[PDB]
Enzyme design. Structure first.
Site, PDB file in Angstrom:
ATOM      1  N   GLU A   1       8.428 -16.017  30.264  1.00  0.00           N
ATOM      2  CA  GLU A   1       8.699 -17.433  30.013  1.00  0.00           C
ATOM      3  C   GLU A   1       9.009 -17.711  28.544  1.00  0.00           C
ATOM      4  O   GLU A   1      10.105 -18.174  28.206  1.00  0.00           O
ATOM      5  CB  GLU A   1       7.507 -18.275  30.477  1.00  0.00           C
ATOM      6  CG  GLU A   1       7.547 -19.724  30.023  1.00  0.00           C
ATOM      7  CD  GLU A   1       8.792 -20.435  30.488  1.00  0.00           C
ATOM      8  OE1 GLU A   1       9.156 -20.258  31.665  1.00  0.00           O
ATOM      9  OE2 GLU A   1       9.413 -21.155  29.678  1.00  0.00           O
TER      10      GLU A   1
ATOM     11  N   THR B   1       0.794  -1.220   0.000  1.00  0.00           N
ATOM     12  CA  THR B   1       0.000   0.000   0.000  1.00  0.00           C
ATOM     13  C   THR B   1       0.833   1.280   0.000  1.00  0.00           C
ATOM     14  O   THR B   1       0.263   2.365   0.154  1.00  0.00           O
ATOM     15  CB  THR B   1      -0.941   0.017   1.210  1.00  0.00           C
ATOM     16  OG1 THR B   1      -0.168   0.099   2.414  1.00  0.00           O
ATOM     17  CG2 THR B   1      -1.811  -1.236   1.256  1.00  0.00           C
TER      18      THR B   1
END
Ligand SMILES: Nc1nc2c(ncn2[C@@H]2O[C@H](COP(=O)(O)OP(=O)(O)OP(=O)(O)O)[C@@H](O)[C@H]2O)c(=O)[nH]1
Ligand SMILES: Nc1nc2c(ncn2[C@@H]2O[C@H](COP(=O)(O)OP(=O)(O)O)[C@@H](O)[C@H]2O)c(=O)[nH]1
Ligand SMILES: [Mg+2]
Lengths: 97, 277, 431, 426, 49
Positions: free
Chosen positions: C246, C171
């Site tokens: 984590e 675009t």
């Protein structure tokens, strides 16, 4: 934005699939995992000293004299494999506490 | 591969059949012996939500031995943004966890305020005298009286009680003085009724109290009013209830706030199952 | 207690955050007025004494034409009046314009708002950022944003959600210019960077959901479903929870290697979902299939370096291990030599929720894969090849050099991208 | 009388410690309220070992429950046996380690260890004669391996003349749930070797083998895995709680199992495990227990004892039961399997007998075994540790918290010396 | 924590109620189908006669 983003009042989130998942991961209990022969937990609480000395080997079910088994060899009524499943060892400790 | 389920005979189905039969047999045995938790809760709910009648007065004065209803009136307060709307009723409340695990009610029990209008088996107090043997007497302003509740039970009688603050005993949420229900008989069960406007309070002391009128209820041994906290919520097996404490609330003009006002509610003569509301 | 702060910068960030916060409202049962109907929500909404819930996020843009629809939309009451920072004029597909000129007068306001939000937060997991490389604001002002957050807060986790420019369709003309120069901020001032492009989502929606003509509205819904599946471990109770530190620890082996790919499965319509049975193996091999990749690159050329699986719903840890063992015996799937146990598993109990009038179906179980692989070097090679072709005759350079930056930034940025590619092949080679 | 102190750490340690206290409360007849509701009297003779007396007749566990992540503290408290546990006995942090031994041992867990040392000293000094300590945790996580080994080092220096037992969850060979799991476990075995008296290895995949083949289950989840290991935990301290014909506690087991201070890595087993369909059709008899006990399918570790050689064998029998058939069968297996036992130690087998069986079961047996076949568990992770450490990957989460490079090199060096020490005595 | 324990107990109550409705519905189906077959055969006998 105005066409698609409409309030949706009727929708409520689900609150029971989680709680079914909790118990499905928690799993089966002791009675359906390890417990054998559907035994009640009141019978097998007995000690060798109380069975041999306190009760003097009292088992009314067994006959006083042994008889030869016949089909299987050796003598059928044996004290060792046929113990007592009476009410458990009890004295004044629970009442004193 | 693919899995099917209980009835289809494919894969490891025999052990599933054995396990399902064992579980069904165990559940049937438990519900046959009556140890079902929903059955215990059903018994407790039918014991606690049993309807009864209320006493009907003739001359408008509260008599001893009448079964009355304690209701905090509604007021458009501006203290908080969310609080209970409408009149509230003072209802007994057992502990939820101990109520689920054990059938018998425990002493002491907590109290609360519920949006309840009809006389139900949880919020109908009879009025007794500490002197006893009071037949056809009139409860008067500034005189000692005591409140008893059966709580849907035909076995025992419990009385309202409250005590001085201590570091080990406090209310559940507001951390102020607390009110509970006990079966013991002492002077900590003694309450007094007082006129709300402080100017005419001692002038109206010693007069028979009206029915369905706003009066203040004060502890005799601690001198604290029975207050209903609307802005603090209590989770309960019966929903969400307002809190109740023992504290005296005063505004800038030293006038009692609408938290401390209480109404004694009798029964309708045309329909005893309904109240004056 | 544990809560993350969401930054949505750029038009893409605002339009993604609209769908994401609508999905959060539907998931926690929040009406558009701002209240629950007449504590898992604490990670996103703050409890007022009135019972009103407001989100702990910010929507930043340099144009008012994208935020005024939020101000006058369905959710006008929910969002804070001050958590929607609007500018005066757009950056207009430029990097220097949004970096050195227009980003300076709103960075103080955004900093003050996020300082108030951090004052509110008693425990802060990290910052989740949503933007686009192809924009002007999301390329320029985002660089200042991360460069300022690194100074302001030291070791907080920085999770990144970037709209990658698609290889064929696009675009904007100067998108390689706006994509090269933001890699400098995203390389050392970012902790982990998930990448998505719109062409792959068009490909997914064409053949999986049987909808011929989709829009950004039903693209941002899939993106929000990914974000919900990521955050569901912090939000809800599960057998094996994963925190924001984590997977951000388990998915990077090196500071210069923090680019995974995100995939989601199953993605299937309501008519098909009644007849197609959905087992854990059938939903964990679909995300391994290359046609379900959500970045336009084939991982068969590359090598899988690390993986992370997040499961939602009625999932048992058995057919997870069985399907992982089945996957480990596929010779088409290739791993690196130094990562033998390259899997990480997190499980949440709550099944995913659906929006009414949406395209997705009611499903019991779902899984999203965050996989770090080597196959992004091909994408970087295509993008900087296009950059070199456009830079060969010195096009559009005056728009950048007249705004205030020096022309040497282009050359040093190309050199940095070349060094990053070289480090990618040096990581990917085996011992 | 000889109290033991239970200790736990991590998410795995919390979900296994709640299950551990469920079977003890069921064994001693403790209701979920906290009182006692049983039918015998031998349950109260030794109840002070695990339970502390209080007002209300309330018996509370002598356990400390620690996790850096506050999420698992809710599930233990909101479980079926959550109100028995003491609210003081929960120690938690605000941020989790997140599968990192460096954060769990040096930075994040370095401040919480001083807070829990007050709790464990208060429970220890309240006992008149402390028997020892017992820990259950997991090596695959940051909290269990990082901070749990920190407690091991701190307790060992503070109480030197004690006994410490550990039930550590080793990494699974086939399926691994964590990518950095070789780092988190190799750095914890090195601290485990010199500071532990007894170590038992429990793996989840061998738990799955028992539940697939021996139990014949279709969905035996993590809970059902916890039932098997909790029965082994309750069975290993049987003679302390209940009287019997031949008593043997934790220390009397240790003195017969550990011929050298570097050989204390055991592998457990629980004998009476059947299927639901075959529950009623096999007689619970001593030959049937000793046949199922020594088989490799019943065993609780990822090591085949046929590939190695047994070194010393324990058996703890429970129930009213006779001693000629115990001595005959367990000399017969030594006589027949002469190639599977060492020849430099005669009488490799130790026997313990109690009177009271577990509830719902006539007769039980717990197997504790020392074997040189446990070295192939360490060989699998060491070759995984080397293959990851050659390329120096996943290391900036370990050297970024103050850990030098030499810590990995000394960890692999001691661990290779351990498996060489196992191999020489084979 | 207190609310979670309360929710767990309420979910136990819901489980028992679900078991009760599941053990009622099968008998309801059996009685309805048996009544249908008996009525059908009686109508057939009468019309044939
Ligand atoms: N997937 C997806 N992408 C979007 C969406 N909205 C915008 N984009 C992307 O944004 C790119 C255009 O740049 P923008 O982000 O709109 O520009 P900007 O950040 O506002 O910066 P300026 O143009 O200077 O104002 C397009 O190429 C799209 O890929 C959306 O709703 N979904
Ligand atoms: N046997 C068993 N293993 C468990 C249980 N819960 C978790 N695990 C294992 O523990 C591992 C994760 O440990 P982790 O939570 O990271 O340890 P922590 O960080 O110290 O809390 C997983 O691989 C699981 O297989 C359980 O209840 N039983
Ligand atoms: Mg813009």
């Amino acid at each position: 934005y105005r066409k698609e983003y409409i309030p949706f009042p009727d929708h409520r989130p689900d609150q029971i699939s989680r709680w079914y998942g909790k118990r499905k991961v928690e799993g089966l209990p002791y009675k359906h995992l390890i417990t054998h022969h559907q035994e009640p937990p009141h019978r097998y609480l007995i000690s060798t000293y109380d069975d041999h000395y306190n009760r003097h080997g009292y088992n009314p079910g067994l006959p006083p004299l042994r008889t030869w088994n016949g089909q299987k060899l050796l003598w059928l009524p044996e004290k060792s494999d046929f113990p007592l499943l009476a009410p458990p060892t009890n004295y004044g400790l629970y009442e004193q506490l | 591969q693919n899995v099917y389920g209980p009835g289809v005979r494919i894969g490891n189905w025999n052990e599933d059949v054995y396990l399902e039969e064992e579980l069904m047999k165990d559940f049937l045995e438990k519900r046959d012996k009556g140890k079902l938790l929903i059955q215990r809760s059903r018994r407790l709910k039918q014991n606690l939500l049993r309807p009864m009648q209320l006493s009907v007065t003739e001359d408008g004065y509260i008599h001893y031995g009448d079964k009355v209803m304690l209701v905090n009136p509604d007021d458009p307060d501006t203290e908080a943004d969310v609080f209970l709307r409408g009149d509230l009723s003072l209802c007994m409340t057992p502990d939820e966890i101990q109520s689920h695990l054990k059938d018998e009610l425990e002493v002491p029990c907590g109290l609360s305020a519920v949006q309840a209008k009809t006389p139900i088996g949880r919020n109908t107090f009879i009025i007794l005298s500490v002197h006893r043997d009071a037949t056809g007497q009139v409860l008067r302003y500034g005189q000692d009286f005591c409140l008893g509740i059966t709580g849907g039970f035909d076995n025992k009688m419990l009385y309202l009680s409250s005590d001085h603050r201590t570091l080990l005993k406090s209310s559940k949420r507001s951390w102020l003085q607390e009110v509970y229900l006990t079966d013991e008989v002492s002077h900590v069960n003694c309450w007094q009724a007082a006129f709300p406007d402080p100017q005419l309070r001692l002038e109206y002391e010693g007069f028979p109290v009206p029915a369905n009128a706003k009066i203040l209820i004060n502890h005799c041994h601690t001198n604290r009013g029975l207050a209903a906290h609307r802005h603090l919520f209590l989770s309960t097996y019966f929903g969400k209830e307002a809190e109740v404490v023992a504290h005296t609330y005063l505004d800038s003009h030293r006038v009692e706030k609408p938290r401390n006002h209480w109404m004694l509610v009798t029964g309708n003569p045309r329909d005893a199952s309904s109240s004056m509301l | 207690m544990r809560e993350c702060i969401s930054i949505h910068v750029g038009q893409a960030g605002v339009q993604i955050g609209n769908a994401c916060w609508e999905l959060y409202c539907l998931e926690h049962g929040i009406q558009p007025d701002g209240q629950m109907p007449s504590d898992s929500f604490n990670t996103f909404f703050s409890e007022t004494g009135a019972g009103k819930h407001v989100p702990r996020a910010v929507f930043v843009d340099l144009e008012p034409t994208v935020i005024d629809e939020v101000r006058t939309g369905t959710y006008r009451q929910l969002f804070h009046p001050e958590q929607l920072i609007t500018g005066k004029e757009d950056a207009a597909n430029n990097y220097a314009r949004g970096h050195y000129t227009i980003g300076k007068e709103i960075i103080d306001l955004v900093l003050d708002r996020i300082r108030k939000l951090a004052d509110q937060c008693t425990g802060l997991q990290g910052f989740l950022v949503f933007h686009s490389f192809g924009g002007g604001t999301g390329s320029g002002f985002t660089s200042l944003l991360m460069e300022r957050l690194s100074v302001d807060y030291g070791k907080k986790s920085k999770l990144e959600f970037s709209i990658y420019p698609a290889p064929q369709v696009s675009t904007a003309v100067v998108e390689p210019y706006n994509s090269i120069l933001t890699t400098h901020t995203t390389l050392e001032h970012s902790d982990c960077a998930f990448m998505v492009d719109n062409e792959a989502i068009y490909d997914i929606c064409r053949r999986n959901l049987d909808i011929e003509r989709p829009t950004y509205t039903n693209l941002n819904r899939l993106i929000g479903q990914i974000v919900s599946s990521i955050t569901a471990s912090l939000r809800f109770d599960g057998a094996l929870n994963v925190d924001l530190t984590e997977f951000q620890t388990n998915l990077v082996p090196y500071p210069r290697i923090h680019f995974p790919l995100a995939t989601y499965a199953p993605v299937i319509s309501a008519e098909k979902a009644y007849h197609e049975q959905l087992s854990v193996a059938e939903i964990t091999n679909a995300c391994f299939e290359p046609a379900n990749q959500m970045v336009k690159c084939d991982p068969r050329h590359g090598k899988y370096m690390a993986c992370c699986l997040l499961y939602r719903g009625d999932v048992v840890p058995k057919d997870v291990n069985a399907a992982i063992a089945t996957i480990k015996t596929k010779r088409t799937i290739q791993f690196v030599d130094w990562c033998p146990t390259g899997f990480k598993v997190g499980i949440n109990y709550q099944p995913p929720t659906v929006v009414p009038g949406g395209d997705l179906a009611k499903v019991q179980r779902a899984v999203c894969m965050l996989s770090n692989t080597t196959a992004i070097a091909e994408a970087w090679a295509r993008l900087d090849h296009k950059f070199d072709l456009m830079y060969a005759k010195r096009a559009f350079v005056h728009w950048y050099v007249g705004e205030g930056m020096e022309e040497g930034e282009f050359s040093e940025a190309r050199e940095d991208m070349a060094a990053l590619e070289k480090d990618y092949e040096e990581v990917g080679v085996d011992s | 009388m000889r109290e033991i102190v239970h200790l736990q750490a991590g998410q795995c340690g919390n979900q296994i410690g709640a299950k551990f206290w469920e079977v003890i409360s069921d064994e001693h007849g403790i209701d979920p309220t906290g009182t006692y509701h049983g039918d015998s009297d031998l349950q109260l003779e030794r109840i002070n070992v695990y339970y502390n007396e209080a007002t209300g007749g309330k018996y509370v566990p002598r356990a400390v429950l620690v996790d850096l992540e506050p999420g698992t503290m809710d599930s233990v408290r909101s479980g079926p046996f959550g109100q028995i546990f003491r609210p003081d006995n929960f120690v938690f942090g605000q941020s989790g380690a997140g599968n990192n031994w460096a954060k769990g041992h040096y930075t994040e867990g370095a401040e919480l260890v001083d807070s829990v040392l007050d709790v464990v000293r208060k429970e220890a000094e309240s006992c008149d004669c402390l028997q020892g300590f017992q820990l259950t945790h997991s090596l695959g996580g940051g909290t269990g391996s990082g901070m749990g080994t920190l407690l091991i080092s701190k307790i060992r220096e503070e109480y030197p003349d004690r006994i410490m037992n550990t039930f550590s969850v080793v990494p699974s060979p086939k399926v691994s749930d964590t990518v950095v799991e070789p780092y988190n476990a190799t750095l914890s075995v090195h601290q485990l070797v010199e500071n532990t008296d007894e170590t038992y290895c429990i793996d989840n995949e061998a738990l799955y083998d028992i539940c697939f083949r021996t139990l014949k289950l279709t969905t035996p989840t993590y809970g059902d895995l916890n039932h098997l290991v909790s029965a082994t935990m309750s069975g290993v301290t049987t003679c302390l709680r209940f009287p019997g014909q031949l008593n043997a506690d934790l220390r009397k087991l240790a003195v017969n199992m550990v011929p050298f201070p570097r050989l204390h890595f055991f592998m457990p087993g629980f004998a009476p495990l059947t299927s639901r369909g075959s529950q009623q059709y096999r007689a619970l008899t001593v030959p049937e227990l000793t046949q199922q006990m020594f088989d490799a399918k019943n065993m609780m570790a990822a090591c085949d004892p046929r590939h190695g050689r047994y070194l010393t064998v324990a058996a703890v029998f429970r129930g009213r039961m006779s001693m000629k058939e115990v001595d005959e069968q367990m000399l017969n297996v030594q006589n027949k399997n002469s190639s599977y036992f060492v020849e430099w130690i005669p009488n490799n087998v130790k026997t313990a007998v109690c009177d009271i069986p577990p509830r719902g079961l006539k007769m039980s047996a717990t197997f504790i075994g020392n074997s040189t076949a446990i070295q192939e568990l360490f060989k699998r992770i060491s070759e995984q540790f080397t293959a990851m450490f050659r390329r120096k990957a996943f290391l900036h989460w370990y050297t970024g918290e103050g850990m030098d490079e030499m810590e990995f090199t000394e960890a692999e060096s001691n661990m290779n010396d351990l498996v060489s020490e196992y191999q020489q005595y084979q | 924590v207190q609310r979670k324990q309360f929710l767990r107990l309420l979910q136990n109550e819901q489980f028992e109620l679900d078991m009760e409705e599941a053990i009622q519905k099968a008998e309801e189906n059996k009685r309805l189908k048996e009544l249908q077959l008996k009525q059908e055969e009686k109508l057939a006998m009468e019309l044939a006669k």
